[PDB]
Design a protein around this ligand. Sequence first.
Ligand code: CLR
Ligand code: CLR
Ligand code: CLR
Ligand code: CLR
Ligand code: CL
Ligand code: CL
Ligand code: CL
Ligand code: CL
Lengths: 697, 697
Amino acid sequence: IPGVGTYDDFHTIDWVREKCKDRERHRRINSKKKESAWEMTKSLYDAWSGWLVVTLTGLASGALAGLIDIAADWMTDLKEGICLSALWYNHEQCCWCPQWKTWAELIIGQAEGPGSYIMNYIMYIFWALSFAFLAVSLVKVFAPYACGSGIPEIKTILSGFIIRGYLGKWTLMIKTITLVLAVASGLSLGKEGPLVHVACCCGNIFSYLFPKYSTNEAKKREVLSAASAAGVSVAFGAPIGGVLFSLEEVSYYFPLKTLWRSFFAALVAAFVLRSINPFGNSRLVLFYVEYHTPWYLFELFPFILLGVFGGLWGAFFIRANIAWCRRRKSTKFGKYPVLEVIIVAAITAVIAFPNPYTRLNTSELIKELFTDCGPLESSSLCDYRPAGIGVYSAIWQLCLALIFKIIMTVFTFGIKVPSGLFIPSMAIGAIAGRIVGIAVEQLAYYHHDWFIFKEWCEVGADCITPGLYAMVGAAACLGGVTRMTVSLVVIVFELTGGLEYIVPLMAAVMTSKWVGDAFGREGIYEAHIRLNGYPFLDAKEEFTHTTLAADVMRPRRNDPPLAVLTQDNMTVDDIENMINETSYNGFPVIMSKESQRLVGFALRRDLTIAIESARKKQEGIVGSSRVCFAQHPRPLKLRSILDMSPFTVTDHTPMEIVVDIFRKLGLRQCLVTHNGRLLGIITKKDILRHMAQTANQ
Amino acid sequence: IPGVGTYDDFHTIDWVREKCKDRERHRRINSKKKESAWEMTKSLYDAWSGWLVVTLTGLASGALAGLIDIAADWMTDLKEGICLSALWYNHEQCCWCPQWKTWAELIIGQAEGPGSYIMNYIMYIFWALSFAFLAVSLVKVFAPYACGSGIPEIKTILSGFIIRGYLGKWTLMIKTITLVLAVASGLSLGKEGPLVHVACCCGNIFSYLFPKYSTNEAKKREVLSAASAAGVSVAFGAPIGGVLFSLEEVSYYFPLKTLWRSFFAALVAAFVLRSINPFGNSRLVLFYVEYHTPWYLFELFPFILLGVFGGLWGAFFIRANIAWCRRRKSTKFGKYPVLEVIIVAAITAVIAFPNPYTRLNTSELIKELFTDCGPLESSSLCDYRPAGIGVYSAIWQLCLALIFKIIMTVFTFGIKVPSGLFIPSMAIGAIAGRIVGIAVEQLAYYHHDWFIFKEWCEVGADCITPGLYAMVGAAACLGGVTRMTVSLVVIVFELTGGLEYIVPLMAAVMTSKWVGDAFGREGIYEAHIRLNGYPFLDAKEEFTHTTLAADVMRPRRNDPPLAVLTQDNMTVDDIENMINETSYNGFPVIMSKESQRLVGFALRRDLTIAIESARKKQEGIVGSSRVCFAQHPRPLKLRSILDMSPFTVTDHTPMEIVVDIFRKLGLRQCLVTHNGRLLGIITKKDILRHMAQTANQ
Ligand SMILES: CC(C)CCC[C@@H](C)[C@H]1CC[C@H]2[C@@H]3CC=C4C[C@@H](O)CC[C@]4(C)[C@H]3CC[C@]12C
Ligand SMILES: CC(C)CCC[C@@H](C)[C@H]1CC[C@H]2[C@@H]3CC=C4C[C@@H](O)CC[C@]4(C)[C@H]3CC[C@]12C
Ligand SMILES: CC(C)CCC[C@@H](C)[C@H]1CC[C@H]2[C@@H]3CC=C4C[C@@H](O)CC[C@]4(C)[C@H]3CC[C@]12C
Ligand SMILES: CC(C)CCC[C@@H](C)[C@H]1CC[C@H]2[C@@H]3CC=C4C[C@@H](O)CC[C@]4(C)[C@H]3CC[C@]12C
Ligand SMILES: [Cl-]
Ligand SMILES: [Cl-]
Ligand SMILES: [Cl-]
Ligand SMILES: [Cl-]
């Protein structure tokens, strides 16, 4: 019957049923292939559909990432001036500087002086405000789903949740435009994490072109996992890192074939980015900073210390941001998203313009911090490198920036614009690591008499490398705020290329994960999932409460008896009334009202669809005709919509085993029986609600 | 009761029961921790036990790998002479060459001449024969399990199979000695793959030191997965590659925490190898060959061609080796393992000595082939690089070697000595890729007028890099013979460090996997698992036969009724007689012989152990006392050994869902019932046998 087997919005899919549908389609297609040669070519196309869709998703993700990077760089450069000779060229490419003219030279006509500084300040603020206004208005008017990182929603979707329109074309376009707008605005956010959502949108749009991936939910989830891998790859140019992230972060179920498919998609996207090098390649992709000297054993001490910082700040953020977000979801603050975005952008621009580090783009700041001092470098971060008073000043200039980055982010992650949390955390950790490395280098230079320095360092030698400390701090902050261990480390290593610095990174990361784990085992993405109330049966959480299945059945003593359907003692009108009277997703069809022996399970959606189709197709089905759910007045027959083998457990079964079954098999509901007689039903909603109750939420 | 919950040799574990035991122990330990501060310290130790065991396993694996490499290098160098000045020094380190003296100089007294060549030939053959004899005798006399790679057995074990003594200390020591002996003998084998078994042995030996990992099988399997990751890491110096290999090859179930634990163990082992650099670091670990020029798009054509070769040869090997192995398991050839090893070693030495490439160590040959021609290099492989006649001769010298390497391996993988298949396949692929690269370079140099070469190459330019072709060929052969895609590619990339050659590798690998997949979807390890007859329910295989649970129940119409135990209508003597009369692993305890309603499941081992313990502990239990399985003449009580919630499915349930339940939940048996009455039992053995029957085995 047409329509049978579909799902509604904000519903969970049944993986077993979807896979049964997929293999039934596979058997039918194989039979057709053996039937004819044209069907054989169709079967070959069906087999190659997965490769085709993953390749298309990778190519689209790479192209979109390149375009977004180019547009964001140009728009960010527009704030501080423009290149009259070539308006399309950005500041860096325009000066590759008489061609570049600042707003002071174009309005006041003076390149220097207090008036020039004032004009530049006002123009910077105005451009930031305009970009923020455009981004928020576009998000609110066209695609409200384009707001946020999207990683929490993608995680919920890959678990089996349905969010219609989240991965649509409208959301893709609006997010693509608004991410560039927000990045140019200068808000404390990034465009690396959100790229995963863009890749997922592309994956869905391409999956619509293949019947195998367009009529089955599980195959769509596999394509989405590959898309997420490709998105991370384009974000950080780390295809292996992207595959690991898909494996450990967003993919609830990851078949082995999906591993290689996601790896191929990530490699294709990385190759697409390489082809347009350096046009669409970001600074992070082109980082490629060489190392001066190898790390040393004693240096692991400050690194671990950095880890502690990464463990602490992230925890604080998880406690702060969430709380603020909750206030936005409870008070009137959420009724004025445009005003909130405008105010945040104004404050950020005003407080960031005076300080060169904050006025600097976050990605460029990260690149500079990771970049090591050189003989040709004369930046304030490397003016001293003996050392002078300016060092202290430099440290001061860093410290303030750090504080700024810590504050704005808390009020920036959650606003109604595309915002990413990877870049801000990386910048904060990089600043902290740079400060720590500067301190360690100064101590080594002024106290080389210590046996540790005298053994592992030499007078007038590059024993200490602050760039490595900044990298370690960035990795520690990312791990402490996301609780990622392997994917994070591999992504950092691929981004920086420091194969010899994998050990220094890992350690720090682990430390952060432990420290944060002391203040809470939940990460930022999971915390946001819980805040939004999405149905998520996280496997990381362990159910320790000693309860039995009898304690979770909905039809309790106080509750009314569960609605059931007789095999062949029901009519179409009665079934319609039952559907319109009960709120159950499905109903268990029993043999008889006395025996109450389970016969099957019929979903309400399929039941209604079958009834309507039969009424519109045949004559005499006006309610008088009976409905028979058994096998072979024109009585209605609805055996095709019922499940012959619903999962069942005993009333005394410990709830831990039930949760295990639900997690591993991805079931939708389980019929709790005893003596072969139906008693109750435990649904994923009930399991989640019980888990929340036992967790004191 | 002591002894309850144990397993016998060659038996499969029940993952659900083990995990229940583990969490019950966790709850008890948490209660004790809350009881006292000493118990709190004990709880901290229990929590840190996993980190401690993985760290110990990594350290032991690294140390053993270094020692094995050093010993193998020295023993191999001993065959062609000795360093009189420093007998402990090897040929390369002795000449770092008056100090080094060949056997001709030490016996005949003439360094050059036909007599010197004859003496060197005879001494080489004698040393190879002696090493082979020692290895085979040690394997056959002390640890028969030390033979082979061990990857198939490790894969079976990680799926829940029990092989007592496979990972013991005796096996570890014997394999460690015999791997070095066999490598020195010159047989067509390697010591990289077998290192995984060494790591697993270390992991088991260390897991014996922690009660959490000593009393639970699943935790031991997690430790073994970490050990396998560390073993691969030490084998190829690719901790990420080792983690991926553990994820995709040997680990049936891989918890998320086990991922980070395995990564940490691999990193620790790699760091241990680094600390002893270059003493215990193999040539593969110290490969680190720089790259001259980047690869080009047209070069992807021959690379794919190499993939085809890798796809073909491997398939052939899977068809040849297995067959020969089957002959060794059916004819009298298997009755003389020592003689077979001696004959194979004699033939290999005799046929390899004349040709310099075969006389050369396989690892050194791989390093040379991957190594690119340089101005200071004057080797025959790079004598020409215009080109002369010698090129052809060089190619000839390669071609013969290739054929040799293809033949001996077929007769070498399966003998009663520690043998690895990674190194031979890598060498074969490297030779093929070197030949292909030489041909392509010659064509480009003599036919640069072609638009392709004129566009992507220049006159007198290093457009073609034969080392990259050799690397691609090695990767293709490895993928074709093992059907590994992501782990293989990452391992190769980490080994070579060519982050810019990931795309050329991947493609080729994929091609091989496809080509081999056309001649059979099973790899060498799975083929050997099937040949040995181990019980393996591979998840990669898909069950498409449309059968129901009723078709797999053992108690069929022809078979006798299933043995059952009444709840409280049985005696100790009757239960003992039933145990000694039936071969079932466990028996279903029913409420009554008339109702036949399932009450629980009692394992034969636990039943016998409980009966014996009760008889030896209490008085009056002499068979007259009744046995009651219900809850509360001194009747025996055996409720603690009975499972209250055995998994059950309906008789009409499709067998596909049953296979899914068995694979995902790792069950041991499922009770098939109808109307709430027990009918039959489907065990993993029956599922495996039905799968074999449906596969026409
Ligand atoms: C909000 C974003 C999307 C707007 C993008 C278009 C921007 C870059 C456009 C809008 C108005 C434009 C300006 C309009 C007028 C002039 C005067 C001319 O003598 C030099 C160029 C200059 C100064 C233009 C530079 C580019 C400009 C700033
Ligand atoms: C090894 C050295 C460098 C570490 C130095 C920092 C130490 C003192 C830090 C690291 C982790 C920290 C712990 C992390 C979290 C908690 C839980 C909280 O409810 C009380 C404090 C407590 C228990 C912290 C105490 C201080 C602590 C132990
Ligand atoms: C089979 C393996 C394990 C044996 C290991 C020990 C080997 C290396 C031993 C056994 C016999 C030894 C030889 C015995 C006698 C002499 C004569 C002396 O003037 C030079 C050293 C020389 C030539 C020895 C070299 C080392 C030697 C070959
Ligand atoms: C793309 C170019 C370079 C590939 C050139 C090699 C081609 C001809 C190879 C690659 C894979 C090969 C196929 C692989 C396996 C099979 C199955 C076998 O039962 C019949 C031959 C057949 C069908 C092969 C035919 C030839 C084949 C198609
Ligand atoms: Cl970001
Ligand atoms: Cl993000
Ligand atoms: Cl090997
Ligand atoms: Cl092997």
